[PDB]
Amino acid sequence: IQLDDDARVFVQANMDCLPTDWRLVNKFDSVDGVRTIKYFECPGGIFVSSQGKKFGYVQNGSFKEASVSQIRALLANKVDVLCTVDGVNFRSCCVAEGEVFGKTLGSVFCDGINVTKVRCSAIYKGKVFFQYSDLSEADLVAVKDAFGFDEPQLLKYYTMLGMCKWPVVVCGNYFAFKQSNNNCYINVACLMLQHLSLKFPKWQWQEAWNEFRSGKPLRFVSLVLAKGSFKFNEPSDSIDFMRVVLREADLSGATCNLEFVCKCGVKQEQRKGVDAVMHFGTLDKGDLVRGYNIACTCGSKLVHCTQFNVPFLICSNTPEGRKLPDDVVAANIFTGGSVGHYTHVKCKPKYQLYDACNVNKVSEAKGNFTDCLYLKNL
Ligand SMILES: [Zn+2]
């Protein structure tokens, strides 16, 4: 015949199999004077047709040339979806069935999955679609309000959401991440965060945290990796991850009084929030009260905490072998060597080692500990 490849495909496909809503025409007509072959009749008074080799449709009395995709879209049931950039304001949009979402929506995620190249279907009806390309200044304001991100951070977030497909499994009363991409610093950090009650002012963070608490941490993890300077597949410190998390949380009630003494002189401060609950340079809470030394330009500062008003404490240090202080609830261990694996112990009632996705009663654990969590006697 003389039809275009696509058009030939479409026309002779639905020839040896004429669909339900249709009707075989197969006739000649004179539309706007021009000889036109009408192939089929479709709902809405549309006749899929050809003016020789040009392809299209007749509606009312006019012929319009159109791609097989445009026709296929015109005949299809439209699906309505909710588009947003921040998960706070939404607009309903229609997308042709069988068509690719990306065409009309730009880059999009749905339920944590990139669907920029998925083909539309009634299953997506009423689903939320997150857009993130071609963002106006208003959009970026919205994003800064709901995510606390700028544009590069947002793009990083969707990138991580794409790449971080780590299975998460149940281990006793906790969850843990299958090991890959040097993710154990994330694993032990989250094992520690699972003991904590937190709320987050920014909506996307609170929502992600709710999923986290219900055993679905990947979204939240992706937010954290986006907020910080973490690189996929690159090992980092558990304490950094925890710090980013806690910097995002509402810890306004948490304070403590600190005193420093060194050659530079004498300083007294009240630290608030994350600064009140995270401490570096000792693993022992008791040292915070009795005083301990950290390194400084002048050599070494003496550090003393005189007042605590905190929901919990995390004391961290460069990895060291030592007997665990008496009140520790959970701890991170950095086991060096060539690479550098992280594992985690919980102390009560059973002293237990969490390593990837296994749990075993501890027989002997000498170190090297890097983070200790305290919930009582503060
Ligand atoms: Zn000094």
Whether residue 20 is found in the same domain as residue 110: no
201 located within any domain: no
Q: Where are the alpha helices (DSSP H) in the chain?
A: 5-13, 68-75, 101-105, 137-146, 151-163, 184-193, 203-213, 218-227, 238-248, 274-277, 285-290
Q: Indicate if 355 belongs to the active site.
A: yes
3-class DSSP state of 106: coil
Q: Is residue 295 part of a domain?
A: yes
d(CA 371, CA 352): 16
Residue 237 within a domain: no
State the DSSP string of 233-289: T----HHHHHHHHHHHS--TT-EEEEEEEETTEEEEEEEETHHHHEEES-S-HHHHH
Whether residue 215 is contained in a domain is answered as: no
CATH number for position 84? 3.10.20.540
Residue whose token pair is 């005083």: 291
Q: Tokens 């600190």 — which residue?
A: 258
Which H or E run includes 345? Answer: strand 341-346
39 and 66 together in one domain: yes
Q: Are strands 128-131 and 78-84 parallel, antiparallel or unpaired?
A: parallel
Using a CB cutoff of 5 Å, list residues around ligand 1, an ion. Answer: 262-264, 296, 298
- For residues 64 and 110, membership in a common domain is answered with no
Nearest-angstrom CA–CA distance, 102 and 131: 10
From the list 110, 120, 184, 190, the catalytic residue is: 184
Q: What is the spatial distance between Cα 155 and Cα 148, in angstroms, rounded to a whole number? A: 13
Structure-token pair, residue 145: 């309000």
CA–centroid distance, 298 to ligand 1, in Å, is: 4
CA–centroid distance, residue 302 to ligand 1 (Å)? 9
Listed residues 75, 95, 122: the one ending a domain: 75
Question: And the tokens for 265?
Answer: 């002189």
Q: Is 184 a catalytic residue?
A: yes
Tell me the residue range of the domain where 87 lies.
78-131
250, part of any domain = no
Q: Are 160 and 225 in contact (CB under 8 A)?
A: yes
Closest CA to 11 of 33, 42, 32: 42
Q: Rounded CA gap, 113 and 134, in Å?
A: 19
Interval between CA 276 and ligand 1 midpoint (Å): 21
Q: If we measure between CA atoms, which residue out of 160, 153, 102 comes closest to residue 131?
A: 102
CA-wise closest residue to 110 among 140, 142, 87: 87
Are 270 and 365 contained in the same domain? yes
One domain for residues 53 and 109: no
Cα distance between residue 92 and residue 181, in whole Å: 38
Nearest to 346 by CA among 357, 362, 363: 362
Taking the centre of ligand 1 as the mean of its atom positions, its distance from the CA of residue 299, in whole angstroms, is 6
Shared-domain flag, residues 13 and 118: no
Q: Which long-range contacts (CB under 8 A, 24 or more apart) does 72-79 make?
A: 72/10, 72/96, 72/98, 72/99, 73/97, 73/98, 73/99, 74/44, 74/46, 75/21, 75/42, 75/43, 75/46, 77/122, 79/120, 79/121, 79/122, 79/124, 79/125
Q: Do 55 and 83 reside in the same domain of the chain?
A: no
Cβ neighbours for 340, distance < 8 A, ≥ 6 positions apart:
235, 334
**Does 293 sit behind a cis peptide bond, omega within 30 degrees of 0 on the bond before it?**
no
Distance between CA atoms of residues 40 and 371, nearest Å? 72
Q: Residue 174 is which amino acid?
A: Y
224, 241 Cβ separation under 8 angstroms: yes
Task: Confirm or deny that 296 is annotated as ligand binding.
Answer: yes
CA dihedral of 184, 189, 195, 200, whole degrees rounded to 10? -130
Domain count along the chain: 3
> Beta 265-272 vs 299-309: how paired, if at all?
unpaired
Is 329 within a domain? yes
Decide if 242 contacts 314 (C-beta within 8 A).
Answer: yes
Query: In a 10 Å sphere around its CB, with 0-12 CB exposed, 13-18 middle and 19+ buried, how is residue 197 labelled?
Result: exposed
Nearest 5°: CA angle at 292, between 291 and 298? 115
The DSSP code for 73 is H
Resolution in angstrom units: 2.6
Q: Cα-flanking dihedrals φ and ψ of residue 307, to 5°?
A: -160, 130
Q: How many other CB atoms are found less than 10 A from the CB of residue 336? A: 9
Query: Could you tell me the distance, in angstroms and rounded to a whole number, from the CA of residue 317 to the centre of ligand 1?
Result: 19
Q: How far apart are CA 190 and CA 171, in angstroms?
A: 13
Question: Does residue 169 belong to any structural domain of this protein?
Answer: no
- Please report how many Cα atoms fall inside a 13 Å half-sphere around the Cα of residue 139, on the Cβ side: 13
Using the mean position of ligand 1's atoms as its centre, give its distance from the Cα of residue 305 in Å. Answer: 17
Does residue 185 contact residue 371 with C-beta atoms inside 8 Å? no
* Cβ-based neighbour number of residue 290 at 10 Å: 11
Q: Does the annotation place 256 within a ligand binding site?
A: no
Q: 256, 341, 344, 372: which one is catalytic?
A: 341
Elucidation technique: X-ray
Which one-letter DSSP state was computed for residue 119?
A: B
Helices and strands counted in the chain (H then E): 11, 23
Q: Between the CA of residue 61 and those of 51, 73, 195, 333, 346, what are the distances in Å?
A: 14, 21, 71, 78, 77
Is 17 a known ligand-binding residue?
no
List the catalytic residue out of 86, 139, 287, 355.
Answer: 355
